[PDB]
Design a protein around this ligand. Structure first.
Ligand SMILES: CCCCCCCCCCCCCCCC(=O)O[C@H](CCCCCCCCCCC)CC(=O)N[C@H]1[C@@H](OP(=O)(O)O)O[C@H](CO[C@@H]2O[C@H](CO)[C@@H](OP(=O)(O)O)[C@H](OC(=O)C[C@@H](CCCCCCCCCCC)OC(=O)CCCCCCCCCCCCC)[C@H]2NC(=O)C[C@@H](CCCCCCCCCCC)OC(=O)CCCCCCCCCCC)[C@@H](O)[C@@H]1OC(=O)C[C@H](O)CCCCCCCCCCC
Ligand SMILES: O=C(O)[C@H]1C[C@@H](O)[C@@H](O)[C@@H]([C@H](O)CO)O1
Lengths: 58, 58
């Protein structure tokens, strides 16, 4: 090979045949949450158990 | 008062209790980058932005 080569550079790959080292160190994490609620409660009462003579009509 | 003509006994009660309440809370703890939509006369900026995330299954 007659190609020029720098002395002080970091010897990065530059041509087709050059080799490079890859450190994967891949780490991905995704999360998703959702919630919903709805509560309705009702309860009504009414009773005499004793009615006046004048109110017995109703 | 020879008989029970004057003998008297009576009781009466009336109790009422009413209650009411209501609550409403909301929280939001995100960060979203938006884009200006238009510049108003006073210099205020109308900003609109949207972000879509597909974690998985939705
Ligand atoms: C938002 C506000 C808007 C305004 C709303 C207006 C009022 C909106 C309307 C509210 C009133 C409900 C109407 C109920 C009757 C009715 O029409 O709808 C029925 C179906 C229900 C539909 C209702 C959906 C509304 C939908 C909701 C709408 C809400 C908006 C059909 C029906 O008719 N079913 C019917 C049938 O059943 P059956 O199907 O199986 O056959 O026959 C059987 C057997 O009949 C009985 O026989 C007895 C003997 O056996 C006999 O006694 P006897 O003496 O003879 O012995 C006895 O005679 C008697 O009472 C003898 C005598 C009693 C006097 C004692 C003193 C009481 C004073 C009491 C004083 C009341 C004080 C308010 O009378 C009366 O003078 C009644 C008083 C009149 C007051 C007038 C108000 C002046 C304003 C005074 C104002 C005061 C100012 C401070 C016979 N009674 C009857 O005939 C029935 C009827 C005869 C009518 C002739 C009298 C002149 C009416 C003249 C005009 C009336 C017009 C309305 O009386 C009533 O109650 C009428 C009540 C009217 C109150 C309106 C208030 C307006 C405020 C005005 C406000 C604007 C009944 O049991 C059955 O009726 C029953 O069960 C009813 C039960 O009892 C009573 C439960 C009440 C609980 C509250 C409701 C709770 C319901 C809640 C859930 C929905
Ligand atoms: O002096 C009267 O008027 C009384 C005395 C009581 O006995 C009273 O109860 C009544 C009675 O009903 C008569 O049968 O008579």
């Amino acid at each position: 090979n007659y190609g020029y080569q720098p002395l002080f550079e970091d010897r990065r790959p530059r041509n087709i045949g050059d080799t490079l080292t890859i450190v994967l160190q891949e780490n991905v994490s995704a999360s998703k949450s959702s919630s919903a609620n709805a509560s309705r409660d009702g309860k009504t009462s009414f009773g005499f158990d004793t009615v006046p003579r004048y109110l017995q009509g109703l | 008062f020879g008989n029970s003509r004057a003998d008297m006994e009576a009781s009466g009660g009336n109790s009422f209790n009413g209650k009411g309440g209501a609550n409403a809370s909301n929280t939001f703890s995100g960060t979203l980058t938006v884009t200006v939509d238009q510049v108003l006369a006073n210099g205020n900026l109308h900003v609109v932005g949207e972000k879509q995330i597909a974690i998985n299954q939705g």
